[PDB]
Short mmCIF file of C-alpha atoms and ligand atoms in Angstrom, two decimals:
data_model
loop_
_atom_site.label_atom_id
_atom_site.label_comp_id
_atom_site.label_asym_id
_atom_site.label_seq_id
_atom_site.Cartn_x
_atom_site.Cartn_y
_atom_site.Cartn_z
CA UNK A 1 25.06 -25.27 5.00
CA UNK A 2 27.77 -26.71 4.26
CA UNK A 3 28.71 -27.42 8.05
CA UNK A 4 32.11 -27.98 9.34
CA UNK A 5 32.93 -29.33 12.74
CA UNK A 6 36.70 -28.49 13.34
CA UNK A 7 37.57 -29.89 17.16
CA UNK A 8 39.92 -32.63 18.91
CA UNK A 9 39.66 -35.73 18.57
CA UNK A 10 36.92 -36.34 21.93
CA UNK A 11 33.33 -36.21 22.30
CA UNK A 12 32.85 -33.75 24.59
CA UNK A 13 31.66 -30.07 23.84
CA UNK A 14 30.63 -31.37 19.84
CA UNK A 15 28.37 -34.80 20.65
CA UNK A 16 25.29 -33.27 21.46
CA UNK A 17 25.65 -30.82 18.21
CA UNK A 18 26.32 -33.86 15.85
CA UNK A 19 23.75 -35.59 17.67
CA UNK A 20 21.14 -32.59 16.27
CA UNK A 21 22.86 -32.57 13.14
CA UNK A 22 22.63 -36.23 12.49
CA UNK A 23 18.92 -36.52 13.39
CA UNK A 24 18.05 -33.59 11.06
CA UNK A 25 19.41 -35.45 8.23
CA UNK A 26 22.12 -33.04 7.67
CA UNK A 27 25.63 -34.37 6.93
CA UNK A 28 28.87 -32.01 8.26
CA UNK A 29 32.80 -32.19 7.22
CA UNK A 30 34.58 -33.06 10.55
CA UNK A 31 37.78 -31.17 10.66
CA UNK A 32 39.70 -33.19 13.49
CA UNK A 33 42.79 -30.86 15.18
CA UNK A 34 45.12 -33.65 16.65
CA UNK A 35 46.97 -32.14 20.03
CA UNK A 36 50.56 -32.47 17.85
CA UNK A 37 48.63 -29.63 15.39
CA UNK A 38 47.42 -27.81 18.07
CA UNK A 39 50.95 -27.22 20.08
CA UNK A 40 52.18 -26.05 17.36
CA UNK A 41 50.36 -23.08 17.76
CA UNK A 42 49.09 -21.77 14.25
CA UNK A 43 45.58 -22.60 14.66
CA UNK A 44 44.95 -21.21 18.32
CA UNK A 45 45.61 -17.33 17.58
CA UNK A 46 43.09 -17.56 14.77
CA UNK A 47 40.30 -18.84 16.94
CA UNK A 48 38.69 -15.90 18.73
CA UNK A 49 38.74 -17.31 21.95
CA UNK A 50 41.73 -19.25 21.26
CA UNK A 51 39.38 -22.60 21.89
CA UNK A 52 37.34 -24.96 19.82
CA UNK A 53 34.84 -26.13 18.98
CA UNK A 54 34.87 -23.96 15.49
CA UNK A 55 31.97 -24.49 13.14
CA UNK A 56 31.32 -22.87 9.64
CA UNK A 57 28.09 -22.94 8.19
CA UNK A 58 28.60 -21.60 4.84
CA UNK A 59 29.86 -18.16 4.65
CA UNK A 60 29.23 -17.80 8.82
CA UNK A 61 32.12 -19.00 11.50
CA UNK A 62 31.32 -19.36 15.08
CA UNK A 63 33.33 -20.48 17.85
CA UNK A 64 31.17 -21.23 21.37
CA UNK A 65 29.39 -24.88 21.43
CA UNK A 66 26.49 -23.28 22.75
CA UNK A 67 26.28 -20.73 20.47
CA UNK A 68 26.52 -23.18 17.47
CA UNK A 69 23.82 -25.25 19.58
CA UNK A 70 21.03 -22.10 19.37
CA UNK A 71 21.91 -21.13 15.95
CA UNK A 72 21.09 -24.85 14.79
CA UNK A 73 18.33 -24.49 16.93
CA UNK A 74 17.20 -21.37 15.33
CA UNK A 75 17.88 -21.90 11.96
CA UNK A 76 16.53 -25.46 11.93
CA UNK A 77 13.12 -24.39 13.72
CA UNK A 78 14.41 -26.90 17.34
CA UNK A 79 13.55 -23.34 19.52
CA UNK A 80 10.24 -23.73 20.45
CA UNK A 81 6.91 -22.32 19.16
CA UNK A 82 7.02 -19.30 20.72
CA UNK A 83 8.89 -16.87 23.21
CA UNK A 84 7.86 -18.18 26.34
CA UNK A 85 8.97 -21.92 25.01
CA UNK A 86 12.42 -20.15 24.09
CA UNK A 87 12.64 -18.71 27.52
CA UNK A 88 12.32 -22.39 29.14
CA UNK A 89 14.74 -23.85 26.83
CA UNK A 90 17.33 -21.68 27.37
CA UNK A 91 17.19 -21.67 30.73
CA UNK A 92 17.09 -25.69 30.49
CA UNK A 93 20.54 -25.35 28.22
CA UNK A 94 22.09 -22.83 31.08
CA UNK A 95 21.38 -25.49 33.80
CA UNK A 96 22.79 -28.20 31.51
CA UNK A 97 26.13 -26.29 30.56
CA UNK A 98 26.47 -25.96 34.37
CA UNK A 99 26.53 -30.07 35.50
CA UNK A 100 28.78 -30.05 31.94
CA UNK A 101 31.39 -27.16 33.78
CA UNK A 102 31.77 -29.49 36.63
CA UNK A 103 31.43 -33.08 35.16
CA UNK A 104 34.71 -30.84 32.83
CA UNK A 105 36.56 -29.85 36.50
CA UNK A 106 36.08 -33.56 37.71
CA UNK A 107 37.18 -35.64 35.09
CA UNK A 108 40.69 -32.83 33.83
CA UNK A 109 40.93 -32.07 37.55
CA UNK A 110 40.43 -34.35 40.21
CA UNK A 111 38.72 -37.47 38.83
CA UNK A 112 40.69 -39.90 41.23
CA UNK A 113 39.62 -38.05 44.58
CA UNK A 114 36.57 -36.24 43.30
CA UNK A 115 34.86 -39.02 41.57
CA UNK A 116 32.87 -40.43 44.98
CA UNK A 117 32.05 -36.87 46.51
CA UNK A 118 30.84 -35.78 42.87
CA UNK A 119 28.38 -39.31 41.93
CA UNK A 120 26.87 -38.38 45.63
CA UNK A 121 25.82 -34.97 44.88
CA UNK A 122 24.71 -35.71 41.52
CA UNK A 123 20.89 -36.44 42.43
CA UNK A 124 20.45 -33.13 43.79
CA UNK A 125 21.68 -31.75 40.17
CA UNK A 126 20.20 -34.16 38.34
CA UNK A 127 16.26 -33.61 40.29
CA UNK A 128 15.69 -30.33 38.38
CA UNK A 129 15.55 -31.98 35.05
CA UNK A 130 13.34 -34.75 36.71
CA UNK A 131 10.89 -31.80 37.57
CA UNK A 132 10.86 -30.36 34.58
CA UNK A 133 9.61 -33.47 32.52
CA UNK A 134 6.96 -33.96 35.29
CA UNK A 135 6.10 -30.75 34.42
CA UNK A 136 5.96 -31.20 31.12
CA UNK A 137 2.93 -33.60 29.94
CA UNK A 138 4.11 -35.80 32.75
CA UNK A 139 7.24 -37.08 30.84
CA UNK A 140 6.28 -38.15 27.70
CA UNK A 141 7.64 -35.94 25.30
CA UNK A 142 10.32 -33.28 25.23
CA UNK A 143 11.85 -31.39 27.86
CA UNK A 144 10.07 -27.94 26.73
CA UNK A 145 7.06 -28.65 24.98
CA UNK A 146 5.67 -31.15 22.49
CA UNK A 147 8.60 -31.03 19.50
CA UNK A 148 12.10 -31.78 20.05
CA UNK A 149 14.79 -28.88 20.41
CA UNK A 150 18.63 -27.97 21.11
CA UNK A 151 18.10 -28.25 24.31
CA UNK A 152 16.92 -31.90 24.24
CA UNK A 153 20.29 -33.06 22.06
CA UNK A 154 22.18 -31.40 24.89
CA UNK A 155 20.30 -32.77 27.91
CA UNK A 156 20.77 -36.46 26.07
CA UNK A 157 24.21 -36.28 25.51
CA UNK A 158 24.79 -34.78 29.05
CA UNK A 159 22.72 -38.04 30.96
CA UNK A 160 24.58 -40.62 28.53
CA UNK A 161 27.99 -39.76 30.04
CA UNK A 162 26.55 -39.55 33.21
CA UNK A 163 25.33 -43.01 32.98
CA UNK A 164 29.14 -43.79 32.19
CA UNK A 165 30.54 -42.21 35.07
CA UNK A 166 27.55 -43.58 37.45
CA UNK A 167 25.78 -46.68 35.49
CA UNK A 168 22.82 -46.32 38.19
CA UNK A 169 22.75 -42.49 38.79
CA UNK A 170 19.07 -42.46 36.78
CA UNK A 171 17.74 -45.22 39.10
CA UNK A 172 15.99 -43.61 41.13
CA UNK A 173 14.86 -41.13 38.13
CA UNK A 174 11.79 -42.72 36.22
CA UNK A 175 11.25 -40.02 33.80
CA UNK A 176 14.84 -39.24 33.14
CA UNK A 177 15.67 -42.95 32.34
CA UNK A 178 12.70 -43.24 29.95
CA UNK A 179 13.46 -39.80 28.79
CA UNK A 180 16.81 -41.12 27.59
CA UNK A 181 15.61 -44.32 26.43
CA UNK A 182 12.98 -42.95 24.11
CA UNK A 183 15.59 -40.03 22.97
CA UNK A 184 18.05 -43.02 21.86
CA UNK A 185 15.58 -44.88 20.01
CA UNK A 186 14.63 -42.25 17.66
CA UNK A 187 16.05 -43.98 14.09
CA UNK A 188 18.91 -41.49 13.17
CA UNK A 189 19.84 -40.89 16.93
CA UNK A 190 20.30 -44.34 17.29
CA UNK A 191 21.93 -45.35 14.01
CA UNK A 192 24.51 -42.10 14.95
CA UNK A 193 25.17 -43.79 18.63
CA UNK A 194 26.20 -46.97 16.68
CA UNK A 195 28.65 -45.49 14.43
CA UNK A 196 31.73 -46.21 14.08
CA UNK A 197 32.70 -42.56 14.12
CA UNK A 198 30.89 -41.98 17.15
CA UNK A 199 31.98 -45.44 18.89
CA UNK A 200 35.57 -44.95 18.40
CA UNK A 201 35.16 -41.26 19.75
CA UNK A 202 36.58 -41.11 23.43
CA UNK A 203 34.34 -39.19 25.42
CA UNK A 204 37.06 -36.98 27.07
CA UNK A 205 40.77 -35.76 26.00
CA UNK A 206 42.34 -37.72 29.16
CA UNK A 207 40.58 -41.21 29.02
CA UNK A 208 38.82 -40.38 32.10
CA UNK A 209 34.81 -40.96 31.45
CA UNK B 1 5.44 -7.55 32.20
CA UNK B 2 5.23 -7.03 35.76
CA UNK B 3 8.75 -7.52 35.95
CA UNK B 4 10.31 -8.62 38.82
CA UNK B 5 13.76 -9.13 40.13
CA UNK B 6 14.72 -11.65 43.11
CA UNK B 7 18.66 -11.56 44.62
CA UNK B 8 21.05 -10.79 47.28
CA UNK B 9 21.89 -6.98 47.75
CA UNK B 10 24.63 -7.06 45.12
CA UNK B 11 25.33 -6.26 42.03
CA UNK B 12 26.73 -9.66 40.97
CA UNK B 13 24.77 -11.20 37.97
CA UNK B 14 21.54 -8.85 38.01
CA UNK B 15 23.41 -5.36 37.04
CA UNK B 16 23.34 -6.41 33.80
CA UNK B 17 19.47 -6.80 33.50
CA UNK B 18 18.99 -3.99 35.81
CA UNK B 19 20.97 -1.32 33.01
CA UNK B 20 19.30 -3.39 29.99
CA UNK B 21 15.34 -2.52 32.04
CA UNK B 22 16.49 0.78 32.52
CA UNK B 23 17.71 1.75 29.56
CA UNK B 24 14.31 0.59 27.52
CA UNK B 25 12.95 2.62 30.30
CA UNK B 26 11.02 -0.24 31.78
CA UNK B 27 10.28 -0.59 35.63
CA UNK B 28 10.70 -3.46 38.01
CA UNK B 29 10.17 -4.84 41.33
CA UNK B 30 13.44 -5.51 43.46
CA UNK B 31 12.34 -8.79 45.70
CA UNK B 32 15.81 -8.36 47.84
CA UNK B 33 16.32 -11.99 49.88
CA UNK B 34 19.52 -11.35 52.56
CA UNK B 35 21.96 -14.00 53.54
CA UNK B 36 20.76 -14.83 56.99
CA UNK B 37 17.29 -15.56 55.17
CA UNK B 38 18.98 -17.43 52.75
CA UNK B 39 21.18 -19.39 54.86
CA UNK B 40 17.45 -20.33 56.56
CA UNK B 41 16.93 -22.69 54.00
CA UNK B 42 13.13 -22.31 53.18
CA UNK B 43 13.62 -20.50 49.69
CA UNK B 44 16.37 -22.45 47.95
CA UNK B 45 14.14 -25.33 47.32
CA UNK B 46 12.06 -23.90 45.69
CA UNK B 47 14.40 -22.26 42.83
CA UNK B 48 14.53 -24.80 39.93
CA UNK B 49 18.49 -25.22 40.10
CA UNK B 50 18.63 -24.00 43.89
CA UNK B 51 20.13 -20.54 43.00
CA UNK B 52 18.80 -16.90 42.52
CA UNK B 53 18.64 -14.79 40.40
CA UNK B 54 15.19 -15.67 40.03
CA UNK B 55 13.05 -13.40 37.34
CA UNK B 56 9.20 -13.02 36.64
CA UNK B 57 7.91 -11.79 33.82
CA UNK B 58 3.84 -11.89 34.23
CA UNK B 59 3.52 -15.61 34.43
CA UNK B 60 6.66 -16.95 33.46
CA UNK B 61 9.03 -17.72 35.90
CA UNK B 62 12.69 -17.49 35.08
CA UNK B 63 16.16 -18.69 36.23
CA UNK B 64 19.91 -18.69 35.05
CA UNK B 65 20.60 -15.29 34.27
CA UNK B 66 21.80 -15.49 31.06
CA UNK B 67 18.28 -16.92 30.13
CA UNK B 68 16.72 -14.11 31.74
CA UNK B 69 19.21 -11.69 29.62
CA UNK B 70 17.87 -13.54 25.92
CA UNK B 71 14.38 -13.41 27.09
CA UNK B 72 14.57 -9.73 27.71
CA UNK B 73 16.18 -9.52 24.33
CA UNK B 74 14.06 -11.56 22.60
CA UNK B 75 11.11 -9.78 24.26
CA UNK B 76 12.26 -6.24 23.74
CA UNK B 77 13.83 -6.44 20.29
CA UNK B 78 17.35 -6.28 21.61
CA UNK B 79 18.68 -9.67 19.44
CA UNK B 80 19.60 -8.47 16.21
CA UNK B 81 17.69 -7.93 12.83
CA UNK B 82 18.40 -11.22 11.58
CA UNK B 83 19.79 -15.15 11.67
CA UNK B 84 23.30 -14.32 11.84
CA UNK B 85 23.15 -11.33 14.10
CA UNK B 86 21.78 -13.54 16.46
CA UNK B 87 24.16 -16.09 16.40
CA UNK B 88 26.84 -13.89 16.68
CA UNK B 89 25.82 -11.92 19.55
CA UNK B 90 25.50 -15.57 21.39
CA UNK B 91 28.65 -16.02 20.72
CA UNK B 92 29.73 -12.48 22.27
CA UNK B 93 27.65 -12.96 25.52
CA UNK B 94 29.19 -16.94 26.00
CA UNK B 95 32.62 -15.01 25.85
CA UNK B 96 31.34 -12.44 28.47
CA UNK B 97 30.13 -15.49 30.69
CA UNK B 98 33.64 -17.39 30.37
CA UNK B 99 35.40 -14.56 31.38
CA UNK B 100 32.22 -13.55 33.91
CA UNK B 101 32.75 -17.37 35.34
CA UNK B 102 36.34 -16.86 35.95
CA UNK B 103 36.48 -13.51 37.55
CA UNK B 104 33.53 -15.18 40.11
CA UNK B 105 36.29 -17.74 41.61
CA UNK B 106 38.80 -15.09 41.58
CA UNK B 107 36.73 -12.88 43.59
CA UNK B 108 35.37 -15.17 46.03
CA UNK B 109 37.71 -18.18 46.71
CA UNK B 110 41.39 -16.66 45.97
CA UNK B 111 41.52 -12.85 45.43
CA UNK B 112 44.61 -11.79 47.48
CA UNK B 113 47.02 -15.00 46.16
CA UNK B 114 45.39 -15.08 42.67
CA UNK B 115 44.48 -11.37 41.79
CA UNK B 116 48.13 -10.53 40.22
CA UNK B 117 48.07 -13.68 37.87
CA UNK B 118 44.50 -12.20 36.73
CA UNK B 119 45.37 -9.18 36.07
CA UNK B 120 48.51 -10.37 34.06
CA UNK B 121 46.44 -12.58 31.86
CA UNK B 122 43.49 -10.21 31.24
CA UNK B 123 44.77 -8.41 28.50
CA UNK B 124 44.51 -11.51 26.80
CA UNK B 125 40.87 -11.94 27.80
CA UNK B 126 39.79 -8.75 26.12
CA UNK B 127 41.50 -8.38 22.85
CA UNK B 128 38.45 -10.86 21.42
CA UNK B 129 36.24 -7.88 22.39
CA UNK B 130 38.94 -5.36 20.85
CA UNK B 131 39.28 -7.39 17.68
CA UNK B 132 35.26 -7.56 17.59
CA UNK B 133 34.77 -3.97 17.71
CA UNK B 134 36.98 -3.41 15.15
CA UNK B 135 35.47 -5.54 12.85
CA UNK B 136 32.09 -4.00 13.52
CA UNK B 137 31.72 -0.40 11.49
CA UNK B 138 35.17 0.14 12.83
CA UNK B 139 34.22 0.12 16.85
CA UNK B 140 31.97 2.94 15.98
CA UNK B 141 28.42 1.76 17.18
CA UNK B 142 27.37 -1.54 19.29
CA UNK B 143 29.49 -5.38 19.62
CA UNK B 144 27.54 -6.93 16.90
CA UNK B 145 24.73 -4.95 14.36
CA UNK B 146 24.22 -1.56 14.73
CA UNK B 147 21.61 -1.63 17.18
CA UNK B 148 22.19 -2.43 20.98
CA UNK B 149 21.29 -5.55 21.95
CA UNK B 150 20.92 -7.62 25.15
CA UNK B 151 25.02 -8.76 24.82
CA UNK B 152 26.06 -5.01 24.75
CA UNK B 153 24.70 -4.68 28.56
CA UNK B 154 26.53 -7.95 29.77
CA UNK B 155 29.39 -6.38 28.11
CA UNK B 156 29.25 -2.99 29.48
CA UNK B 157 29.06 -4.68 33.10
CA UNK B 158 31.69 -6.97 32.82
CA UNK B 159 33.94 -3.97 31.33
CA UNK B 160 33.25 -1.79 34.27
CA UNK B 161 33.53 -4.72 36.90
CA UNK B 162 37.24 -5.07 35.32
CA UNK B 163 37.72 -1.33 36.04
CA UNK B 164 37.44 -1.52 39.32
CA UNK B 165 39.67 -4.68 39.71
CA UNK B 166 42.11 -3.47 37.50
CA UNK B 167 41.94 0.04 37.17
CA UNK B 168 43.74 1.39 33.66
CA UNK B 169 43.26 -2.36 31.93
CA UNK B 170 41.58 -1.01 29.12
CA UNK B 171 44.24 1.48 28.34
CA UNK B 172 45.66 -0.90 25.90
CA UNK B 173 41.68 -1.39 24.28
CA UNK B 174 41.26 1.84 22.98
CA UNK B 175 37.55 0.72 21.06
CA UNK B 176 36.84 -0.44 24.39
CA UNK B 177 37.22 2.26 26.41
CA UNK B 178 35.43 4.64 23.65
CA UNK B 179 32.82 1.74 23.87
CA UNK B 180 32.38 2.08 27.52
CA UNK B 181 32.34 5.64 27.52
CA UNK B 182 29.84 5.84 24.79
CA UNK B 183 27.49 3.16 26.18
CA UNK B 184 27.75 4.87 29.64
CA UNK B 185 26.62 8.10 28.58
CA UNK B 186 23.28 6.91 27.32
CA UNK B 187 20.86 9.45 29.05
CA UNK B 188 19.55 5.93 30.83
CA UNK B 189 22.28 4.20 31.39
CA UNK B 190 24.39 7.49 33.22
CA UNK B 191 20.89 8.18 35.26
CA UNK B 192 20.94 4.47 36.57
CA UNK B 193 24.38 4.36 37.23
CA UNK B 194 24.80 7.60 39.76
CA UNK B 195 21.33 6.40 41.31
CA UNK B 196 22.02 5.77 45.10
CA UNK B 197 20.15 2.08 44.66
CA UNK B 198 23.13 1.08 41.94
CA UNK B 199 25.72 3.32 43.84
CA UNK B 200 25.14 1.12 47.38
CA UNK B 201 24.79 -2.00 46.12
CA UNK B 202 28.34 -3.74 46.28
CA UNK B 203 29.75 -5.45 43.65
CA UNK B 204 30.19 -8.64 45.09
CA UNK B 205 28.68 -10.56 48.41
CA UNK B 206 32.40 -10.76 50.25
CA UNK B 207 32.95 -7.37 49.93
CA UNK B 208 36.11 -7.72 47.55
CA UNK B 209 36.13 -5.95 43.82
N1 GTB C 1 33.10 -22.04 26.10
C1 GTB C 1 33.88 -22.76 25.17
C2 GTB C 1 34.83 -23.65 25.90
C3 GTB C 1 35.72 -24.36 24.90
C4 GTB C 1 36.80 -25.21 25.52
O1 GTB C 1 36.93 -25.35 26.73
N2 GTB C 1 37.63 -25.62 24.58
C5 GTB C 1 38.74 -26.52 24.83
C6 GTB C 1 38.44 -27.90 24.24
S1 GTB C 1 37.05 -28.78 25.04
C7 GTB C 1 38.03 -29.59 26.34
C8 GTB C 1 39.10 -30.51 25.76
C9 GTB C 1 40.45 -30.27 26.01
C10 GTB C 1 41.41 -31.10 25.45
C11 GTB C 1 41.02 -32.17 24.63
N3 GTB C 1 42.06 -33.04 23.97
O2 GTB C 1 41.74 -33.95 23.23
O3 GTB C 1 43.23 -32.76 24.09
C12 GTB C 1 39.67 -32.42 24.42
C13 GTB C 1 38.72 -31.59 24.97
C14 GTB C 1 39.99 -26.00 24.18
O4 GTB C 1 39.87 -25.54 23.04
N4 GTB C 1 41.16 -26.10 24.80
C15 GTB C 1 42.38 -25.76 24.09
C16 GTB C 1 43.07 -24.60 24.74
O5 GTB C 1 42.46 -23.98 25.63
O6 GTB C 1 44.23 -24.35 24.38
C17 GTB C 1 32.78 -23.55 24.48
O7 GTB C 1 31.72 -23.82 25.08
O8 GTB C 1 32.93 -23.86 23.30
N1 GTB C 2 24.25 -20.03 36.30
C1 GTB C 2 23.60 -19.37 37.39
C2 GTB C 2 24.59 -19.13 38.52
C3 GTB C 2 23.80 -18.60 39.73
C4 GTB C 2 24.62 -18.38 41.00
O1 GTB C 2 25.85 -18.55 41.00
N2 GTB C 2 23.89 -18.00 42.05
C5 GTB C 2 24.44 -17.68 43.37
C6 GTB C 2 24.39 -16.17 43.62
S1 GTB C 2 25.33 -15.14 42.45
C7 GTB C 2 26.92 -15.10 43.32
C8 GTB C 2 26.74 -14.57 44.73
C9 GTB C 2 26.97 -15.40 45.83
C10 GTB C 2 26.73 -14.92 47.11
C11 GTB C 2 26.22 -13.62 47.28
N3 GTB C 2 25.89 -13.10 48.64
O2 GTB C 2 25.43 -11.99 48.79
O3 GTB C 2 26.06 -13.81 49.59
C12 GTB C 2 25.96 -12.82 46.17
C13 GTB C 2 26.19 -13.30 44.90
C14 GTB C 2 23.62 -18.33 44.46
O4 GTB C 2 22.39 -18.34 44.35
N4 GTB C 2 24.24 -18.80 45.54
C15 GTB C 2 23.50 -19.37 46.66
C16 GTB C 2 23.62 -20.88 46.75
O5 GTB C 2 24.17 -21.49 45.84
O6 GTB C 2 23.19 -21.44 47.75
C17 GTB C 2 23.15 -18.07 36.71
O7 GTB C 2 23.82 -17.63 35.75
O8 GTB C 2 22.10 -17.57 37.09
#
């Protein structure tokens, strides 16, 4: 620490970080890059992929949200217990980052004609994270393992704006809606969800959600 | 270990893992599944997220090849000597997978109307990778640390994908193109890349590159 958020004014790639951050009981700076700053076009060439999220955590800056999601994994002991639990979760955070690339495409690209195609062939994307929980002590506790992990602050933040976009896409998911359910009950989780900061967040840049 | 491999007869997103194997000389089973099986429908159901590659390592069972790529690291030593090694090198291999993403859709939904504009804005795309280099022990020895790690072999692919697309676009990146030629010449790494098995796979599955 100290941690520094620096990102536009949305949700989107930085909830499920803060999210982590919040129920650890660490507090962060927010550094908030309006789109008037960005256009001007100072800030962009000093980013290394000329994107953001950027995060600083001390003397260490990282750009990549998923990068800064497996180094607060790592150095805040949310990667498992061993290798074969760090395998899992990564490979649960891969499949999540890919609904989040096209849930991204629909809502910046075609949210008007996509939107009906998209919330049909969500089940089939969504089943895989249903098996995994069944898998996993039949539902009842994390998605890899018994402790809570990056992975699980991702896959939370990822099924609340899909219940936004769909309100009954988890339906027909029992393990997945009590997943979620549990996941925002935990006391800082859902003390964060109520915020002000976090309520008054849109969820995209566009006002698509 | 036993390690095996399961994929199309391409190169694709498994030449990565193939050169990081070889090079900790480490063998592996090639399970090769063809199209015409594929299009069968038996085996995609049972992958987790319906896609290959699919990976075993004894008894673990892997998918998302980027999650098969940390594993190997984690598993072999090949993810730094400490915290901030580690996040860094994330952050290296999610800029190899951004630009590995988009170089996917040009490739196989708009290569002869979209391969120009590519080309113009990949010069762009590497100088990250340039600027990296030079930051590291001057671009003398590997992307981050000074031991190679699972991101240097992602690297290395994507850098000699590029050549073949865009032949001379590293003669602008000239730490890159000592980087390739260095990491290329590993006794290894230059065995597994004239082998006939690496030589006849293709590139891609629609036979563009
Ligand atoms: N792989 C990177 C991808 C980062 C990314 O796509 N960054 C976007 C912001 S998230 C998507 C987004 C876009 C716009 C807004 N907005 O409020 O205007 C909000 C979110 C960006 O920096 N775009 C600026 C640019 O490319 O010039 C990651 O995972 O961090
Ligand atoms: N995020 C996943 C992405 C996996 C992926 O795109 N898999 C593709 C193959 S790699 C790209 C590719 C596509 C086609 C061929 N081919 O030979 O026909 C080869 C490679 C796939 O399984 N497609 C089959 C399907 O979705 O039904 C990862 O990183 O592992």
């Amino acid at each position: 620490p100290p941690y520094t958020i620096v990102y536009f004014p949305v949700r989107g790639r930085c909830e499920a970080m803060r999210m982590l951050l919040a129920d650890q009981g660490q507090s962060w700076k927010e550094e908030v890059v309006t789109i008037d700053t960005w256009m001007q076009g100072l800030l962009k060439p000093t980013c290394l992929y000329g994107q953001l999220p950027k995060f600083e955590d001390g003397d260490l800056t990282l750009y990549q949200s998923n990068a800064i999601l497996r180094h607060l994994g790592r150095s805040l002991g949310l990667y498992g217990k061993n290798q074969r639990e760090a395998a899992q979760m990564d490979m649960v955070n891969d499949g999540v980052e890919d609904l989040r690339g096209k849930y991204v495409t629909l809502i910046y690209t075609n949210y008007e004609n996509g939107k009906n195609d998209y919330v049909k062939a969500l089940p089939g994307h969504l089943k895989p994270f249903e098996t995994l929980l069944s898998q996993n002590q039949g539902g009842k506790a994390f998605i890899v393992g018994d402790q809570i992990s990056f992975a699980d602050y991702n896959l939370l933040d990822l099924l609340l704006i899909h219940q936004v976009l769909a309100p009954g896409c988890l339906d027909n998911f029992p393990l997945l809606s009590a997943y979620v359910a549990r996941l925002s009950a935990r006391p800082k989780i859902k003390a964060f969800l109520s915020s002000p900061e976090h309520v008054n967040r849109p969820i995209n840049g566009n006002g698509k959600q």
